[PDB]
RNA sequence: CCGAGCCUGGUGAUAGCUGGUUGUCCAAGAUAGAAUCUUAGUUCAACUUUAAAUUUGCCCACAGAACCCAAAUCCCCUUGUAAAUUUAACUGUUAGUCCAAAGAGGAACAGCUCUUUGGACACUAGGAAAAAACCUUGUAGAGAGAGUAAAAAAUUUAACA
């Protein structure tokens, strides 16, 4: 009968080809996931639904930030097929208190701290 | 409902925007009662706010009848001859203030379904489309399959 | 523009007499093109409420060609209304009895199923062979192109094309052929 | 069949999809299917499947 | 919402702009400008210094009452709501282009 | 006045004659009218395009039900082009 | 249309999402005065501000936790030294 | 109920009419709508379907200029398909970077 | 002719649905996204013991705020002003 | 019905989509190994 | 209009059964079973609802849970989240259908019947032809705006020294 599926740990062991493909350095790994709900939590079990609302993904295509740590990766594994994950990487360093306002996302997972909304 | 309710195309009175804009509300006629709890808001409004309203809008004229009436009402006459009456029965001062100001901002023509959200009296530039715009001509203008 | 209202409207919504030759062209896409031109989608001023149809003339419907063994496999079926009145005819029989009916039915199918279908089919015109009445080929505008080109035959291939085309193999001389 | 399952250029295999549960397909699948991966459907046996 | 406009023409907008009637405003965004023989395209929008599109507010009115009914059958589920949205009228007074190019 | 066009504000008879006399005032050749395109000549709702050519170069063309109507409409177009009251003209400045 | 192209180029899939097509002010006074911000842009700015605040909060919390682990392991080493002294 | 549920089909029908009209004008100028709109987006012009259709009707010259723009962008994209890099990018295929 | 027994999508005999390249490409792109998610869920930043006790203070503070909000429940206040303002219904001019 | 049947039990649409995605695509070079080599 | 007349009265007889049940708007909300001359009903439980008091509620990390003869589960600090328990007052649900999975019965029949896990329906919308139960998709309005979701079946087969 249908039950919540346990995932083998060997699945989450990236190979060098996967590293070269996705551009993720195993050393100095990222620390923040941006997550976006892509599929309906409907026609899904209650545990997936409640974990979704736990993570705060009740609305779709609305990116939410979370940590890159096992306690959270557990839930993200439970509902990995409902959601898209990408790292959060920024060149301009963390947003300072003076630049809290003029922040801006990018579709590429970038988080820019200055948003001049103007071409070069 | 649209099919039962009449309709009209968007238009302005005398092309109000091109030259000088004019307050298209001629006149307001309040009818309030000294007594009657229904009219206390209207009485407070004519006490305090109507003065500044008239000072702000000199072009409009305001008449106050102040006679016994179970329901206080307000009539609004426009340049077009359009009359529009609203009953301010049991209405607060700020409510009827908003009411009067939106009546002033409103144009003197019936609010009904508007077909198009725009109006261009000169819509065609570069020439309006006809079947022969985007096809070439023929040498000596010969139809297909004809000798001369 | 600088045109007056009624003449501009008239020129915009005027009807056009298209002309097409069906010499070895398939009735499917022939009727596709015809249905488009008759509905009036090709007009950027199209709206179904406005009758923006156009007249179309087809020629040489007799000399039309299917893809495959359609002449034998395809069946046009109809019921007269009476018992035993269910009759099927292959496209070959239907062509022999009426060379226009194939393209007519194709267009009647491509067209939408409203009451304007019959008016559009009335505006349409079909001719089995290369012949048009004087008025009908007089009130034409242009001949829109055929959808498919016709491949060349050996009697049509000029000699220089054959010479430019290379030979692919060397036969042994000892061979009857 | 072993060299076929080694040579298939398709990056996607019933083994991988089912053991990972990447689309909630465990709903439609059976718990025995992850070992009867593609070869079996009920009693039948489809060797061309891999 | 994109419009095409000329001088001395009207447009309607489905909300209030917090502007007194008769007041003039400059439209910044411009996807396109064109004359009888040429056109100016943006990537996506044109420069501020290039164009000058000015519109005067004419009217602020409550839209005609829109009925909405929700009804489900044999479940005793019926409801009405009558809504009037605010909407504003603009008139395009002038369009000018600059020598800058 | 904005909306109304010129020949809707001002009535004319023999507009092609008016055009001819104006072109004589300007000292240019008497133009000839030639249909450029047509459709449905035998049809009950014919469509014609008549262009007016001076020195074998066109200055105006007009559509029409019939040849005569298209010709007078093309003359009207030429008069608009001359007097500068085209529909593509500069709006009134304020 | 073109959403994948926009994403590959770095722009938003929907041009209405972000960029100059929506974020700029749609009108200003003819005198050159600036108009007040739109409610949409205001709420988007507030959302982005909360987003950045949350990012900073999480990074600070987690790096502080890592530093605490480090100093706890250091104290462990030190108390092992103390034991071997005893 | 039908009045209130008719709004979505109004939106849909008018979009279908805009697309039909633009497709007609595009194939009148030799192109078709998918290529046309894709190339327009690639050249960074976000002109929606209603104004595109209105330009096709009242301003055919501008519309065929846009169609030529689109076709040239197609040919540049095909040159890119031939050589992705190691080549000069198309003059129209170039993009403006915002920040 | 051509009917099939019972309802056409349930039971021992049902209408045969068929797959298309559209559906195939859609689902393979979905599971490509899911494989990228696998890759990114790999490569953790911290371990269990590093992750153990850093957010305890924040969680405690949030729960104490919830506790305070739950305990803080009383009727609203009552005012002579709001009680007497009902007398203003019989306002009238002298 | 049961899991095991005499007939081939019709599978779920997602199931047969998965089975239609997963196949043995036979790999060969762009050049056939007979004519050229 | 006699398996025992008709009139009146008791009598507004009784009915676990049928039918019916009147103005507007909003919100939360289909839920394991036990006993019953009981299975067309009811009482309790369970679920749901309202108002209160308090603090832990859900997800869960190592460790931990049988000899006989698998999917998963219980417990579970962290973490991510904001719910939970108790107190007071009732009502209503307690005649259920399909899909996937593990099984039993039957013919390895049923749009068949019986248990368990999950989903959907009995709430909107798009699609698959129309379609309850399949796939996408949920929190509510106006728009003559835009990006997407699921979403269109492919197959032609046999010569021989
Ligand atoms: Mg049936
Ligand atoms: Mg079963
Ligand atoms: Mg009796
Ligand atoms: Mg008797
Ligand atoms: Mg009773
Ligand atoms: Mg009943
Ligand atoms: Mg509700
Ligand atoms: Mg009973
Ligand atoms: Mg716990
Ligand atoms: Mg059954
Ligand atoms: Mg059953
Ligand atoms: Zn070969």
Swiss-Prot record, chain B:
Q: In which tissues is it expressed?
A: High relative levels in skeletal muscle and testis. Lower levels of expression in the heart, brain, placenta, lung, liver, kidney, pancreas, spleen, thymus, prostate, ovary, small intestine, colon and leukocytes. Expression is coregulated with TWNK.
What are the subcellular locations of this protein? Answer: Mitochondrion
Q: Name one GO biological process term.
A: translation
Q: Name one GO molecular function term.
A: structural constituent of ribosome
Q: Which GO terms describe its cellular component?
A: mitochondrial inner membrane; mitochondrial large ribosomal subunit; mitochondrial ribosome; mitochondrion
- Provide this UniProt record's keywords sorted from A to Z: Mitochondrion, Ribonucleoprotein, Ribosomal protein, Transit peptide
Q: What is its main location?
A: mitochondrion
Task: State the family it belongs to.
Answer: Belongs to the mitochondrion-specific ribosomal protein mL43 family.
The subunit field of the Swiss-Prot or TrEMBL record says: Component of the mitochondrial large ribosomal subunit (mt-LSU). Mature mammalian 55S mitochondrial ribosomes consist of a small (28S) and a large (39S) subunit. The 28S small subunit contains a 12S ribosomal RNA (12S mt-rRNA) and 30 different proteins. The 39S large subunit contains a 16S rRNA (16S mt-rRNA), a copy of mitochondrial valine transfer RNA (mt-tRNA(Val)), which plays an integral structural role, and 52 different proteins.
This one is known as Large ribosomal subunit protein mL43
Please specify the portion of the entire protein covered by the chain, as first and last position out of its full length. 2 to 149 of 215
Curated annotation (Swiss-Prot), chain F:
Residue stretches making up the DRBM domain: 14-84
Subcellular location per the Swiss-Prot or TrEMBL entry: Mitochondrion
Q: Which domain of life is it from?
A: Eukaryota
* Associated pathology: Combined oxidative phosphorylation deficiency 16: An autosomal recessive, mitochondrial disorder characterized by hypertrophic cardiomyopathy, liver steatosis, and decreased levels of mitochondrial complexes I and IV in heart and skeletal muscle.
Q: What does this chain do? A: Component of the 39S subunit of mitochondrial ribosome. May have a function in the assembly/stability of nascent mitochondrial polypeptides exiting the ribosome.
Assembly and partners are described as:
Component of the mitochondrial large ribosomal subunit (mt-LSU). Mature mammalian 55S mitochondrial ribosomes consist of a small (28S) and a large (39S) subunit. The 28S small subunit contains a 12S ribosomal RNA (12S mt-rRNA) and 30 different proteins. The 39S large subunit contains a 16S rRNA (16S mt-rRNA), a copy of mitochondrial valine transfer RNA (mt-tRNA(Val)), which plays an integral structural role, and 52 different proteins.
**Family per similarity comment:** Belongs to the ribonuclease III family. Mitochondrion-specific ribosomal protein mL44 subfamily.
The protein's name: Large ribosomal subunit protein mL44
Kindly list the organism's lineage: Eukaryota, Metazoa, Chordata, Craniata, Vertebrata
From Swiss-Prot, chain G:
GO molecular function term, any single one:
structural constituent of ribosome
Top-level taxon of the source organism: Eukaryota
- Record's keyword terms, sorted: Mitochondrion, Ribonucleoprotein, Ribosomal protein, Transit peptide
GO BP terms in the entry = mitochondrial translation; translation
Q: How does it assemble?
A: Component of the mitochondrial large ribosomal subunit (mt-LSU). Mature mammalian 55S mitochondrial ribosomes consist of a small (28S) and a large (39S) subunit. The 28S small subunit contains a 12S ribosomal RNA (12S mt-rRNA) and 30 different proteins. The 39S large subunit contains a 16S rRNA (16S mt-rRNA), a copy of mitochondrial valine transfer RNA (mt-tRNA(Val)), which plays an integral structural role, and 52 different proteins. mL52 connects the central protuberance to the body of the ribosome.
Q: What is this protein called?
A: Large ribosomal subunit protein mL52
In the record, what lineage is assigned to the organism producing the protein?
Eukaryota, Metazoa, Chordata, Craniata, Vertebrata
Q: Where is the composition biased (Basic and acidic residues)?
A: 77-86
Subcellular location per UniProt equals: Mitochondrion
| Annotated GO CC locations | mitochondrial inner membrane; mitochondrial large ribosomal subunit; mitochondrion; nucleoplasm
What does the similarity note say? Belongs to the mitochondrion-specific ribosomal protein mL52 family.
Swiss-Prot record, chain J:
Q: Which family does it belong to?
A: Belongs to the universal ribosomal protein uL10 family.
Subunit field text: Component of the mitochondrial large ribosomal subunit (mt-LSU). Mature mammalian 55S mitochondrial ribosomes consist of a small (28S) and a large (39S) subunit. The 28S small subunit contains a 12S ribosomal RNA (12S mt-rRNA) and 30 different proteins. The 39S large subunit contains a 16S rRNA (16S mt-rRNA), a copy of mitochondrial valine transfer RNA (mt-tRNA(Val)), which plays an integral structural role, and 52 different proteins. uL10m contributes a single cysteine residue to a zinc-binding site with mL66.
Lineage, opening ranks:
Eukaryota, Metazoa, Chordata, Craniata, Vertebrata
User: What name does this protein carry?
Assistant: Large ribosomal subunit protein uL10m
Q: Where in the cell is it found?
A: Mitochondrion
């Amino acid at each position: 009968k249908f039950t919540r599926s346990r995932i083998p740990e060997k699945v989450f062991q990236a190979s060098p080809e996967d590293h070269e493909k996705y551009g993720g350095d195993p050393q100095n790994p990222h620390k923040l996931h941006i997550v976006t709900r892509i599929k309906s939590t409907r026609r899904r079990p209650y545990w997936e639904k409640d974990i979704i609302k736990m993570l705060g993904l009740e609305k779709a295509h609305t990116p939410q930030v979370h940590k890159n740590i096992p306690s959270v990766n557990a839930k993200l594994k439970v509902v990995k097929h409902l959601i898209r994950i990408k790292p959060l990487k920024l060149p301009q360093g963390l947003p300072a208190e003076e630049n809290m306002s003029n922040t801006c996302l990018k579709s590429t997972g970038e988080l820019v701290v200055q948003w001049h909304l103007k071409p070069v | 409902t649209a099919r039962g309710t009449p309709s009209r195309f968007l238009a302005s009175v005398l092309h109000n925007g091109l030259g000088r804009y004019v307050q298209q509300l001629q006149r307001l006629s309040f009818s309030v009662s000294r007594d009657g709890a229904s009219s206390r808001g209207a009485r407070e409004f004519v006490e305090r706010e109507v003065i500044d309203f008239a000072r702000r809008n000199p072009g409009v004229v305001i008449y106050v009848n102040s006679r016994p009436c179970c329901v206080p009402r307000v009539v609004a006459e426009y340049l077009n001859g359009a009359v529009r009456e609203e009953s301010i029965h049991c209405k607060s001062v700020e409510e009827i203030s908003t009411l009067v100001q939106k009546l002033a901002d409103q144009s003197g023509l019936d609010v009904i379904r508007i077909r198009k959200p725009f109006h261009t009296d000169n819509p065609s530039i570069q020439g309006q489309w006809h079947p022969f715009t985007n096809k070439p001509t023929t040498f000596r203008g010969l139809r297909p399959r004809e000798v001369q | 523009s600088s045109f007056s209202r009624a003449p501009q409207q008239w020129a915009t919504f005027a009807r056009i007499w298209y002309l097409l030759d069906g010499k070895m062209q398939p009735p499917g896409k022939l009727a596709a093109m015809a249905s488009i031109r008759l509905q009036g989608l090709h007009k950027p001023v199209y709206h179904a409420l406005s009758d923006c149809g156009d007249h179309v003339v087809i020629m040489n419907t007799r000399h039309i060609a299917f893809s495959g063994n359609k002449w034998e496999q395809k069946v046009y079926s109809s019921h007269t209304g009476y018992p035993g009145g269910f009759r099927q005819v292959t496209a070959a029989q239907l062509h022999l009895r009426d060379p226009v009916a194939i393209v007519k039915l194709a267009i009647y199918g491509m067209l939408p199923k409203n009451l304007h279908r019959r008016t559009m089919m009335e505006r349409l015109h079909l001719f089995p062979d290369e012949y048009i009445p004087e008025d009908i080929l007089k009130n034409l505008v242009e001949e829109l192109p055929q959808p498919r080109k016709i491949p060349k035959r050996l009697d049509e291939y000029t000699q220089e094309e054959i010479d430019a085309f290379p030979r692919l193999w060397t036969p042994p001389e000892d061979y009857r052929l | 069949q072993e060299e076929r399952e080694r040579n298939n250029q398709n990056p996607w295999t019933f083994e991988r999809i089912a053991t990972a549960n990447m689309l909630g397909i465990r709903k439609v699948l059976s718990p025995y299917d992850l070992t009867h991966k593609g070869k079996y459907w009920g009693k039948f046996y489809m060797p061309k499947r891999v | 919402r994109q419009w095409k406009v000329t001088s001395e023409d009207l447009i309607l907008i489905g909300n209030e702009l917090d502007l007194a009637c008769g007041e003039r405003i400059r439209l910044e965004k411009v996807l396109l400008v064109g004359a009888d023989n040429f056109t100016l395209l943006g990537k996506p929008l044109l420069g501020k210094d290039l164009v000058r599109v000015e519109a005067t507010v004419i009217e602020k009115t409550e839209s005609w009452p829109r009925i909405i009914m929700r009804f489900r059958k044999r479940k005793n589920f019926k409801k009405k709501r009558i809504v009037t949205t605010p909407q504003t009228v603009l008139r395009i007074n002038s369009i000018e282009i600059a020598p800058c190019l | 006045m904005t909306g109304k066009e010129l020949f809707e504000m001002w009535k004319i008879i023999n507009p092609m004659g008016l055009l001819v006399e104006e072109l004589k005032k300007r000292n240019v050749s008497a133009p000839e009218s030639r249909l450029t395109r047509q459709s449905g000549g035998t049809t009950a709702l014919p469509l014609y395009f008549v262009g007016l050519y001076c020195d074998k170069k066109l200055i105006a063309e007009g559509p029409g039900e019939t040849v005569l109507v298209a010709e007078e409409e093309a003359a009207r177009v030429a008069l608009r082009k001359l007097y500068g009251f085209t529909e593509n003209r500069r709006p009134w400045n304020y | 249309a073109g959403g994948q192209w926009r994403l590959q180029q770095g722009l938003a899939a929907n041009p209405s999402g972000y960029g100059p097509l929506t974020e700029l002010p749609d009108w200003s006074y003819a005198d050159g005065r600036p108009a007040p911000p739109m409610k949409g842009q205001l709420r988007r700015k507030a959302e982005r501000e909360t987003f950045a605040r949350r990012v900073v909060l999480l990074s600070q919390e987690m790096d502080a936790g890592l530093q605490a682990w480090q100093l706890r392991q250091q104290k462990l080493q030190e108390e092992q030294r103390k034991q071997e002294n005893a | 109920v039908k009045c209130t549920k008719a709004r979505y089909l109004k939106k849909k029908n008018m979009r279908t009419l805009w697309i039909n009209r633009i497709t007609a004008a595009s194939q009148e100028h030799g192109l078709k709508y998918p290529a046309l709109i894709g190339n327009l987006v690639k050249c960074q012009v976000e002109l929606n379907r209603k104004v595109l259709a209105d330009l096709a009707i009242y301003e055919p010259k501008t519309f065929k200029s846009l169609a030529a723009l689109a076709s040239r962008r197609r040919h540049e994209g095909f040159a890119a398909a031939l050589g992705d890099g190691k080549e000069p990018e198309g003059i129209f295929s170039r993009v403006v970077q915002y920040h | 002719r051509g009917r099939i027994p019972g309802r056409q999508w349930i039971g021992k005999h049902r209408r045969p649905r068929f797959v298309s390249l559209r559906a195939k490409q859609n689902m393979i792109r979905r599971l490509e996204i899911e494989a990228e998610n696998h890759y990114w869920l790999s490569m953790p930043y911290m371990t269990r013991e590093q992750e153990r006790g850093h957010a305890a203070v924040r969680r405690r503070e949030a729960f104490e705020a919830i506790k305070a909000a739950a305990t803080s429940k009383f009727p609203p206040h009552r005012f002579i002003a709001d009680q007497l303002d009902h007398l203003n219904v019989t306002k009238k001019w002298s | 019905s049961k899991a095991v049947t005499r007939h081939r039990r019709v599978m779920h649409f997602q199931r047969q989509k998965l089975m239609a995605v997963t196949e043995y695509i036979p790999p060969k070079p762009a050049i056939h190994p007979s004519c050229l080599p």
